[PDB]
PDB file of C-alpha atoms and ligand atoms in Angstrom:
ATOM      1  CA  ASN A   2      25.361  -6.173  -3.717  1.00 12.07           C
ATOM      2  CA  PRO A   3      23.994  -8.565  -1.118  1.00 12.63           C
ATOM      3  CA  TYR A   4      20.630  -7.174  -1.485  1.00 13.80           C
ATOM      4  CA  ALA A   5      19.973  -7.334  -5.149  1.00 13.82           C
ATOM      5  CA  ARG A   6      17.142  -9.968  -5.918  1.00  9.83           C
ATOM      6  CA  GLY A   7      15.722 -11.032  -9.102  1.00  7.47           C
ATOM      7  CA  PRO A   8      16.301 -10.727 -12.785  1.00  6.78           C
ATOM      8  CA  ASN A   9      17.714  -7.583 -14.582  1.00  9.09           C
ATOM      9  CA  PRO A  10      14.542  -4.900 -14.753  1.00  9.82           C
ATOM     10  CA  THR A  11      12.801  -3.902 -18.008  1.00 13.01           C
ATOM     11  CA  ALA A  12       9.967  -1.439 -18.482  1.00 17.73           C
ATOM     12  CA  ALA A  13       7.819  -4.276 -19.368  1.00 17.85           C
ATOM     13  CA  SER A  14       8.549  -6.439 -16.320  1.00 18.19           C
ATOM     14  CA  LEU A  15       8.073  -3.539 -14.250  1.00 22.20           C
ATOM     15  CA  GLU A  16       4.983  -2.435 -15.920  1.00 20.00           C
ATOM     16  CA  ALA A  17       3.495  -5.883 -15.689  1.00 23.07           C
ATOM     17  CA  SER A  18       0.609  -6.629 -13.122  1.00 22.32           C
ATOM     18  CA  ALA A  19       3.085  -9.056 -11.323  1.00 22.14           C
ATOM     19  CA  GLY A  20       7.036  -9.340 -10.889  1.00 20.77           C
ATOM     20  CA  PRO A  21       8.919 -12.332 -10.809  1.00 18.56           C
ATOM     21  CA  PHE A  22       8.301 -13.749  -7.396  1.00 17.55           C
ATOM     22  CA  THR A  23       5.284 -15.820  -6.269  1.00 17.49           C
ATOM     23  CA  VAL A  24       3.215 -14.272  -3.245  1.00 17.27           C
ATOM     24  CA  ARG A  25       1.331 -15.610  -0.378  1.00 18.62           C
ATOM     25  CA  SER A  26      -0.216 -13.874   2.379  1.00 17.91           C
ATOM     26  CA  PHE A  27      -1.728 -14.308   5.617  1.00 19.62           C
ATOM     27  CA  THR A  28      -3.871 -12.314   8.159  1.00 21.48           C
ATOM     28  CA  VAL A  29      -1.960 -11.174  11.309  1.00 19.39           C
ATOM     29  CA  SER A  30      -3.706 -13.168  14.393  1.00 19.28           C
ATOM     30  CA  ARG A  31      -2.670 -10.524  17.130  1.00 21.61           C
ATOM     31  CA  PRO A  32      -1.661  -7.114  15.846  1.00 18.85           C
ATOM     32  CA  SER A  33       0.678  -5.649  18.051  1.00 21.39           C
ATOM     33  CA  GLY A  34      -0.479  -1.933  18.340  1.00 20.11           C
ATOM     34  CA  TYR A  35      -2.712  -1.362  15.139  1.00 19.24           C
ATOM     35  CA  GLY A  36      -6.019  -2.637  14.069  1.00 20.55           C
ATOM     36  CA  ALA A  37      -5.620  -5.293  11.554  1.00 19.63           C
ATOM     37  CA  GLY A  38      -3.058  -6.657   9.200  1.00 18.00           C
ATOM     38  CA  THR A  39      -2.400  -8.764   5.983  1.00 15.40           C
ATOM     39  CA  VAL A  40       1.371  -9.705   5.360  1.00 16.71           C
ATOM     40  CA  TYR A  41       2.354 -10.556   1.659  1.00 18.44           C
ATOM     41  CA  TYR A  42       5.396 -12.098   1.058  1.00 19.37           C
ATOM     42  CA  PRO A  43       7.400 -13.675  -1.797  1.00 20.62           C
ATOM     43  CA  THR A  44       7.826 -17.809  -1.310  1.00 24.17           C
ATOM     44  CA  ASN A  45      10.944 -17.984  -3.902  1.00 18.96           C
ATOM     45  CA  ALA A  46      13.310 -14.839  -3.217  1.00 15.12           C
ATOM     46  CA  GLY A  47      17.023 -15.946  -3.293  1.00 17.13           C
ATOM     47  CA  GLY A  48      17.341 -14.224   0.030  1.00 16.23           C
ATOM     48  CA  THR A  49      16.091 -12.323   2.729  1.00 16.77           C
ATOM     49  CA  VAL A  50      14.040  -9.140   1.667  1.00 17.75           C
ATOM     50  CA  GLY A  51      12.913  -5.778   2.963  1.00 17.23           C
ATOM     51  CA  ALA A  52       9.881  -5.014   4.610  1.00 17.07           C
ATOM     52  CA  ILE A  53       7.066  -2.317   3.926  1.00 20.11           C
ATOM     53  CA  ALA A  54       4.296  -1.132   5.928  1.00 20.29           C
ATOM     54  CA  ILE A  55       1.329   0.598   4.183  1.00 21.12           C
ATOM     55  CA  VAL A  56      -1.394   2.787   5.793  1.00 24.66           C
ATOM     56  CA  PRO A  57      -4.757   3.620   4.335  1.00 21.33           C
ATOM     57  CA  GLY A  58      -6.379   7.225   4.722  1.00 22.41           C
ATOM     58  CA  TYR A  59      -9.203   8.590   6.615  1.00 20.63           C
ATOM     59  CA  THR A  60     -12.113   6.342   7.059  1.00 21.06           C
ATOM     60  CA  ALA A  61     -10.043   3.634   4.801  1.00 18.72           C
ATOM     61  CA  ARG A  62      -9.439   0.090   5.283  1.00 18.84           C
ATOM     62  CA  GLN A  63      -6.797  -2.208   3.685  1.00 18.17           C
ATOM     63  CA  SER A  64      -9.025  -2.426   0.369  1.00 19.58           C
ATOM     64  CA  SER A  65      -7.873   1.041  -0.541  1.00 19.02           C
ATOM     65  CA  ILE A  66      -4.158  -0.090  -0.496  1.00 22.02           C
ATOM     66  CA  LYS A  67      -4.433  -3.868  -1.152  1.00 21.09           C
ATOM     67  CA  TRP A  68      -2.908  -3.667  -4.485  1.00 19.35           C
ATOM     68  CA  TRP A  69       0.500  -2.688  -3.475  1.00 17.93           C
ATOM     69  CA  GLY A  70       0.578  -5.730  -1.363  1.00 17.08           C
ATOM     70  CA  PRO A  71       1.008  -8.400  -4.128  1.00 13.03           C
ATOM     71  CA  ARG A  72       2.598  -6.017  -6.720  1.00 11.82           C
ATOM     72  CA  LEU A  73       5.454  -5.114  -4.398  1.00 12.38           C
ATOM     73  CA  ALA A  74       5.915  -8.532  -2.650  1.00 12.09           C
ATOM     74  CA  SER A  75       6.026  -9.897  -5.941  1.00 14.23           C
ATOM     75  CA  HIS A  76       9.250  -8.106  -6.892  1.00 13.51           C
ATOM     76  CA  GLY A  77      10.985  -9.129  -3.606  1.00 12.79           C
ATOM     77  CA  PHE A  78       9.279  -7.601  -0.101  1.00 12.59           C
ATOM     78  CA  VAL A  79       7.447  -8.463   2.532  1.00 11.20           C
ATOM     79  CA  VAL A  80       4.494  -6.131   2.541  1.00 10.13           C
ATOM     80  CA  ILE A  81       2.039  -5.427   5.545  1.00  9.40           C
ATOM     81  CA  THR A  82      -1.051  -3.347   4.605  1.00 11.91           C
ATOM     82  CA  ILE A  83      -2.811  -2.333   8.015  1.00 13.48           C
ATOM     83  CA  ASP A  84      -6.159  -1.081   9.351  1.00 14.51           C
ATOM     84  CA  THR A  85      -5.798   1.454  12.253  1.00 13.56           C
ATOM     85  CA  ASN A  86      -7.143   1.046  15.422  1.00 16.68           C
ATOM     86  CA  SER A  87      -9.860   3.669  14.566  1.00 13.18           C
ATOM     87  CA  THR A  88     -10.581   4.498  10.894  1.00 11.11           C
ATOM     88  CA  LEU A  89     -10.686   8.101  12.592  1.00 11.27           C
ATOM     89  CA  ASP A  90      -7.026   8.102  13.420  1.00 13.19           C
ATOM     90  CA  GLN A  91      -4.843  11.166  12.710  1.00 11.47           C
ATOM     91  CA  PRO A  92      -1.523  10.933  10.816  1.00 11.54           C
ATOM     92  CA  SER A  93       1.000  11.245  13.846  1.00 12.81           C
ATOM     93  CA  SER A  94      -1.363   7.978  15.484  1.00 10.16           C
ATOM     94  CA  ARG A  95      -1.182   6.312  11.878  1.00  5.53           C
ATOM     95  CA  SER A  96       2.684   6.678  11.982  1.00  6.08           C
ATOM     96  CA  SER A  97       2.734   5.002  15.275  1.00  3.48           C
ATOM     97  CA  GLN A  98       0.907   1.976  14.053  1.00  2.00           C
ATOM     98  CA  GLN A  99       2.501   1.941  11.020  1.00  2.00           C
ATOM     99  CA  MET A 100       6.218   1.682  12.584  1.00  2.00           C
ATOM    100  CA  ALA A 101       4.395  -1.104  15.099  1.00  2.00           C
ATOM    101  CA  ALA A 102       3.339  -3.107  12.119  1.00  2.00           C
ATOM    102  CA  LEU A 103       7.025  -3.026  10.852  1.00  2.00           C
ATOM    103  CA  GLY A 104       7.926  -3.995  14.340  1.00  2.00           C
ATOM    104  CA  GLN A 105       5.852  -6.935  14.346  1.00  2.00           C
ATOM    105  CA  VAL A 106       7.063  -8.052  10.797  1.00  2.00           C
ATOM    106  CA  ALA A 107      10.459  -7.989  12.718  1.00  2.00           C
ATOM    107  CA  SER A 108       9.152 -10.099  15.293  1.00  2.00           C
ATOM    108  CA  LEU A 109       7.428 -12.686  12.820  1.00  2.00           C
ATOM    109  CA  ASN A 110      11.051 -13.186  11.105  1.00  2.00           C
ATOM    110  CA  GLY A 111      12.215 -14.547  14.329  1.00  2.00           C
ATOM    111  CA  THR A 112       8.996 -16.466  15.062  1.00  2.00           C
ATOM    112  CA  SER A 113       9.558 -20.077  13.621  1.00  2.00           C
ATOM    113  CA  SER A 114       5.506 -20.803  13.219  1.00  2.00           C
ATOM    114  CA  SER A 115       5.384 -17.522  10.930  1.00  2.00           C
ATOM    115  CA  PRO A 116       5.397 -17.928   7.078  1.00  2.00           C
ATOM    116  CA  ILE A 117       8.139 -15.235   6.864  1.00  2.00           C
ATOM    117  CA  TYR A 118      10.363 -16.949   9.396  1.00  2.00           C
ATOM    118  CA  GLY A 119      14.075 -15.751   8.369  1.00  2.00           C
ATOM    119  CA  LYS A 120      12.615 -14.172   5.212  1.00  2.00           C
ATOM    120  CA  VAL A 121      12.796 -10.306   6.454  1.00  2.00           C
ATOM    121  CA  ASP A 122      15.986  -8.260   6.328  1.00  2.00           C
ATOM    122  CA  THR A 123      14.935  -6.396   9.389  1.00  2.00           C
ATOM    123  CA  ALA A 124      17.374  -3.744   8.694  1.00  2.00           C
ATOM    124  CA  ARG A 125      15.658  -2.380   5.599  1.00  2.00           C
ATOM    125  CA  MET A 126      12.411  -0.970   5.861  1.00  2.00           C
ATOM    126  CA  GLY A 127       9.983   1.397   3.881  1.00  2.00           C
ATOM    127  CA  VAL A 128       6.658   3.039   4.666  1.00  2.00           C
ATOM    128  CA  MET A 129       3.875   3.697   2.170  1.00  2.00           C
ATOM    129  CA  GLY A 130       0.388   5.258   2.835  1.00  2.00           C
ATOM    130  CA  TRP A 131      -2.866   7.021   1.248  1.00  2.00           C
ATOM    131  CA  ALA A 132      -3.735  10.483   2.476  1.00  2.00           C
ATOM    132  CA  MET A 133      -3.583  11.098   6.098  1.00  2.00           C
ATOM    133  CA  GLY A 134      -1.591   7.694   6.159  1.00  2.00           C
ATOM    134  CA  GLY A 135       0.790   9.366   3.612  1.00  2.00           C
ATOM    135  CA  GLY A 136       1.159  11.975   6.141  1.00  2.00           C
ATOM    136  CA  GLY A 137       1.685   9.133   8.618  1.00  2.00           C
ATOM    137  CA  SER A 138       4.404   7.787   6.568  1.00  2.00           C
ATOM    138  CA  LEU A 139       6.431  11.083   6.068  1.00  2.00           C
ATOM    139  CA  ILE A 140       6.033  11.129  10.037  1.00  2.00           C
ATOM    140  CA  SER A 141       7.366   7.777  10.274  1.00  2.00           C
ATOM    141  CA  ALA A 142      10.347   8.841   7.943  1.00  2.00           C
ATOM    142  CA  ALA A 143      11.075  11.718   9.999  1.00  2.00           C
ATOM    143  CA  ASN A 144      11.101  10.080  13.181  1.00  2.00           C
ATOM    144  CA  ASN A 145      13.048   6.952  11.986  1.00  2.00           C
ATOM    145  CA  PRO A 146      15.881   8.162   9.318  1.00  2.00           C
ATOM    146  CA  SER A 147      17.453   4.501   9.390  1.00  2.00           C
ATOM    147  CA  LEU A 148      13.937   3.631   7.021  1.00  2.00           C
ATOM    148  CA  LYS A 149      15.283   3.181   3.397  1.00  2.00           C
ATOM    149  CA  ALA A 150      12.503   4.383   1.392  1.00  2.00           C
ATOM    150  CA  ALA A 151       9.494   6.323   1.829  1.00  2.00           C
ATOM    151  CA  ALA A 152       6.637   6.557  -1.034  1.00  2.00           C
ATOM    152  CA  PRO A 153       3.333   8.265   0.038  1.00  2.00           C
ATOM    153  CA  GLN A 154       0.280   8.768  -2.118  1.00  2.00           C
ATOM    154  CA  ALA A 155      -1.969  12.204  -2.105  1.00  2.00           C
ATOM    155  CA  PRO A 156      -0.290  12.831   1.276  1.00  2.00           C
ATOM    156  CA  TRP A 157      -1.782  15.093   3.889  1.00  2.00           C
ATOM    157  CA  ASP A 158      -0.482  16.243   7.356  1.00  2.00           C
ATOM    158  CA  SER A 159      -1.439  19.425   9.271  1.00  2.00           C
ATOM    159  CA  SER A 160       2.106  20.771   8.611  1.00  2.00           C
ATOM    160  CA  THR A 161       3.733  20.391   5.034  1.00  2.00           C
ATOM    161  CA  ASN A 162       7.384  21.007   6.726  1.00  2.00           C
ATOM    162  CA  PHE A 163       8.912  17.893   6.485  1.00  2.00           C
ATOM    163  CA  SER A 164      12.625  19.273   5.843  1.00  2.00           C
ATOM    164  CA  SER A 165      13.497  16.627   8.937  1.00  2.00           C
ATOM    165  CA  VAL A 166      13.048  13.849   6.214  1.00  2.00           C
ATOM    166  CA  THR A 167      16.604  12.431   5.056  1.00  2.00           C
ATOM    167  CA  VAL A 168      14.700   9.162   3.755  1.00  2.00           C
ATOM    168  CA  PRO A 169      14.409   8.564  -0.231  1.00  2.00           C
ATOM    169  CA  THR A 170      10.819   9.949  -0.596  1.00  2.00           C
ATOM    170  CA  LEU A 171       8.500   9.399  -3.649  1.00  2.00           C
ATOM    171  CA  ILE A 172       5.353  11.245  -3.466  1.00  2.00           C
ATOM    172  CA  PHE A 173       2.791  10.377  -5.707  1.00  2.00           C
ATOM    173  CA  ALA A 174      -0.073  13.055  -5.959  1.00  2.00           C
ATOM    174  CA  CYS A 175      -3.133  13.376  -7.856  1.00  2.00           C
ATOM    175  CA  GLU A 176      -3.817  16.320 -10.316  1.00  2.00           C
ATOM    176  CA  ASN A 177      -7.340  17.002  -9.354  1.00  2.00           C
ATOM    177  CA  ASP A 178      -7.287  16.160  -5.616  1.00  2.00           C
ATOM    178  CA  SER A 179      -9.990  18.136  -3.973  1.00  2.00           C
ATOM    179  CA  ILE A 180      -9.482  16.201  -0.273  1.00  2.00           C
ATOM    180  CA  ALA A 181      -5.938  16.933  -0.146  1.00  2.00           C
ATOM    181  CA  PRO A 182      -5.381  19.554  -2.870  1.00  2.00           C
ATOM    182  CA  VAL A 183      -1.616  19.050  -4.340  1.00  2.00           C
ATOM    183  CA  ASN A 184      -0.860  22.955  -4.094  1.00  2.00           C
ATOM    184  CA  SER A 185      -1.484  22.877  -0.241  1.00  2.00           C
ATOM    185  CA  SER A 186      -0.345  19.446   0.544  1.00  2.00           C
ATOM    186  CA  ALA A 187       1.584  17.118  -1.705  1.00  2.00           C
ATOM    187  CA  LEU A 188       3.707  19.755  -3.298  1.00  2.00           C
ATOM    188  CA  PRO A 189       4.937  22.169  -0.512  1.00  2.00           C
ATOM    189  CA  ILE A 190       5.592  18.931   1.229  1.00  2.00           C
ATOM    190  CA  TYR A 191       7.520  17.912  -1.741  1.00  2.00           C
ATOM    191  CA  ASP A 192       9.323  21.156  -1.592  1.00  2.00           C
ATOM    192  CA  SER A 193       9.981  21.248   2.018  1.00  2.00           C
ATOM    193  CA  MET A 194      12.553  18.274   1.776  1.00  2.00           C
ATOM    194  CA  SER A 195      16.052  19.220   1.185  1.00  2.00           C
ATOM    195  CA  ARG A 196      18.272  16.842   2.353  1.00  2.00           C
ATOM    196  CA  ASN A 197      17.086  13.445   0.600  1.00  2.00           C
ATOM    197  CA  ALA A 198      16.678  11.651  -2.789  1.00  2.00           C
ATOM    198  CA  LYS A 199      13.094  12.805  -3.599  1.00  2.00           C
ATOM    199  CA  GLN A 200      10.705  12.649  -6.516  1.00  2.00           C
ATOM    200  CA  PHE A 201       7.298  14.045  -7.277  1.00  2.00           C
ATOM    201  CA  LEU A 202       4.576  12.364  -9.552  1.00  2.00           C
ATOM    202  CA  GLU A 203       1.451  13.926 -10.270  1.00  2.00           C
ATOM    203  CA  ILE A 204      -1.153  11.686 -12.080  1.00  2.00           C
ATOM    204  CA  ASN A 205      -2.962  13.776 -14.863  1.00  2.00           C
ATOM    205  CA  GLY A 206      -6.614  14.162 -14.066  1.00  2.00           C
ATOM    206  CA  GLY A 207      -6.337  12.105 -10.894  1.00  2.00           C
ATOM    207  CA  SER A 208      -8.760  12.157  -8.084  1.00  2.00           C
ATOM    208  CA  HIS A 209      -7.757  11.718  -4.350  1.00  2.00           C
ATOM    209  CA  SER A 210      -8.025   7.925  -4.897  1.00  2.00           C
ATOM    210  CA  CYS A 211      -5.588   8.013  -8.281  1.00  2.00           C
ATOM    211  CA  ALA A 212      -3.013   5.466  -6.579  1.00  2.00           C
ATOM    212  CA  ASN A 213      -5.460   3.356  -4.745  1.00  2.00           C
ATOM    213  CA  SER A 214      -6.488  -0.385  -5.585  1.00  2.00           C
ATOM    214  CA  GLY A 215      -8.349  -0.272  -8.964  1.00  2.00           C
ATOM    215  CA  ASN A 216      -6.563   2.865 -10.463  1.00  2.00           C
ATOM    216  CA  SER A 217      -6.347   2.889 -14.075  1.00  2.00           C
ATOM    217  CA  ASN A 218      -2.186   3.687 -14.203  1.00  2.00           C
ATOM    218  CA  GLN A 219      -1.243   0.582 -12.087  1.00  2.00           C
ATOM    219  CA  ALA A 220       1.632   0.192 -14.818  1.00  2.00           C
ATOM    220  CA  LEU A 221       3.259   3.411 -14.377  1.00  2.00           C
ATOM    221  CA  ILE A 222       2.267   3.897 -10.690  1.00  2.00           C
ATOM    222  CA  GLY A 223       3.489   0.490  -9.807  1.00  2.00           C
ATOM    223  CA  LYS A 224       6.735   0.678 -12.082  1.00  2.00           C
ATOM    224  CA  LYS A 225       7.675   3.744 -10.177  1.00  2.00           C
ATOM    225  CA  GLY A 226       6.774   2.568  -6.684  1.00  2.00           C
ATOM    226  CA  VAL A 227       8.743  -0.906  -7.259  1.00  2.00           C
ATOM    227  CA  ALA A 228      11.667   0.702  -8.693  1.00  2.00           C
ATOM    228  CA  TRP A 229      11.937   3.423  -5.991  1.00  2.00           C
ATOM    229  CA  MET A 230      11.842   0.456  -3.294  1.00  2.00           C
ATOM    230  CA  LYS A 231      14.413  -1.421  -5.398  1.00  2.00           C
ATOM    231  CA  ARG A 232      16.787   1.153  -5.811  1.00  2.00           C
ATOM    232  CA  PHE A 233      16.836   2.337  -2.235  1.00  2.00           C
ATOM    233  CA  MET A 234      15.871  -0.265  -0.107  1.00  2.00           C
ATOM    234  CA  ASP A 235      17.878  -2.749  -1.998  1.00  2.00           C
ATOM    235  CA  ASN A 236      20.753  -0.202  -2.773  1.00  2.00           C
ATOM    236  CA  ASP A 237      19.867  -1.896  -6.307  1.00  2.00           C
ATOM    237  CA  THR A 238      21.322   0.439  -8.921  1.00  2.00           C
ATOM    238  CA  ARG A 239      20.071  -1.463 -11.710  1.00  2.00           C
ATOM    239  CA  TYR A 240      16.898   0.112 -10.862  1.00  2.00           C
ATOM    240  CA  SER A 241      18.396   3.454 -10.738  1.00  2.00           C
ATOM    241  CA  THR A 242      17.226   4.808 -14.398  1.00  2.00           C
ATOM    242  CA  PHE A 243      13.569   3.489 -13.658  1.00  2.00           C
ATOM    243  CA  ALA A 244      13.396   5.251 -10.248  1.00  2.00           C
ATOM    244  CA  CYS A 245      15.272   8.709 -11.242  1.00  2.00           C
ATOM    245  CA  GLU A 246      13.856   8.973 -14.811  1.00  2.00           C
ATOM    246  CA  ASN A 247      10.901  11.501 -15.686  1.00  2.00           C
ATOM    247  CA  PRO A 248       8.735   8.926 -17.674  1.00  2.00           C
ATOM    248  CA  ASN A 249       7.624  11.622 -19.921  1.00  2.00           C
ATOM    249  CA  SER A 250       4.192  10.056 -19.960  1.00  2.00           C
ATOM    250  CA  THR A 251       1.145  11.703 -20.823  1.00  2.00           C
ATOM    251  CA  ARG A 252      -0.430  10.230 -17.612  1.00  2.00           C
ATOM    252  CA  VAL A 253       1.612  12.434 -15.447  1.00  2.00           C
ATOM    253  CA  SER A 254       0.773  16.053 -15.358  1.00  2.00           C
ATOM    254  CA  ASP A 255       3.718  17.234 -13.074  1.00  2.00           C
ATOM    255  CA  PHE A 256       6.895  15.594 -12.623  1.00  2.00           C
ATOM    256  CA  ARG A 257       9.887  16.793 -10.560  1.00  2.00           C
ATOM    257  CA  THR A 258      13.046  15.136  -8.798  1.00  2.00           C
ATOM    258  CA  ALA A 259      15.939  16.290  -6.924  1.00  2.00           C
ATOM    259  CA  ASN A 260      19.265  14.275  -5.931  1.00  2.00           C
ATOM    260  CA  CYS A 261      18.488  11.000  -7.397  1.00  2.00           C
ATOM    261  CA  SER A 262      21.305   8.634  -8.462  1.00  2.00           C
TER     262      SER A 262
HETATM  263  O1  C9C B 301      -8.987  17.642   5.268  1.00  2.00           O
HETATM  264  C1  C9C B 301      -8.185  17.221   4.994  1.00  2.00           C
HETATM  265  O2  C9C B 301      -7.145  17.810   4.940  1.00  2.00           O
HETATM  266  C2  C9C B 301      -7.743  15.811   4.963  1.00  2.00           C
HETATM  267  C3  C9C B 301      -9.012  15.005   4.684  1.00  2.00           C
HETATM  268  C4  C9C B 301      -8.790  13.506   4.716  1.00  2.00           C
HETATM  269  C5  C9C B 301      -7.665  12.839   4.653  1.00  2.00           C
HETATM  270  C6  C9C B 301      -7.717  11.537   4.614  1.00  2.00           C
HETATM  271  O3  C9C B 301      -6.593  10.880   4.836  1.00  2.00           O
HETATM  272  O4  C9C B 301      -8.611  11.121   4.117  1.00  2.00           O
HETATM  273  C7  C9C B 301      -8.673  10.778   2.719  1.00  2.00           C
HETATM  274  C8  C9C B 301      -9.445   9.469   2.495  1.00  2.00           C
HETATM  275  O5  C9C B 301      -8.884   8.120   3.042  1.00  2.00           O
HETATM  276  C9  C9C B 301      -6.717  13.765   4.821  1.00  2.00           C
HETATM  277  C10 C9C B 301      -6.750  15.258   4.736  1.00  2.00           C
END
């Protein structure tokens, strides 16, 4: 596997706050089609790595999703967290901006002054996001089936029919979400997907912000997010158990998965 990076994973190493690689970051000088961006990247991966673009929810900014940046980059990914052109943008707009940020990461991979010059395999990308940004991530996956993974959190869209999604998709959900209730959003969305590897992970007692920066389940959520991206963006079957398993954890009130190998 030309995409495998880093040491063989363990539960402990995936539950830790940081993976094996050293992380640095920079601010995007001139955002190409979105509001603002921070790029997180590993300084010492042994090869090119995939890129992941992450979008907040309605009214929210990079701080709500920031924690994914170092958590994912330290395991071997270039991660861009964005602010949208407006905090009031809707999911379809969020998806356009998410993909524009991926495009600019790819541009910077070819830009000799960039710290990520030659660090990105631009053919291997993923999408994540909170709430309307999670709906935007699903729209992004629907419109761009060459994306290798999606892992939205507490998603919402005006439609729950994402039968168009063929991208391996992990849905983080929050049991007590009153903004995007699981029964009208995350779960109908999950059930709609028929052609992909997919997973549903609902955090026991979680509010709408249960997968945001500062959540109290970073060990489990971080392990699952990293394992999903490693398994499907890197084709890295060393992560197949971590990606596909029921964690059989008390922090999970609802677990579902299908077509996972
Ligand atoms: O009313 C809704 O259905 C609805 C309301 C808000 C959101 C959202 O993205 O903002 C959540 C906080 O960032 C999504 C769905």
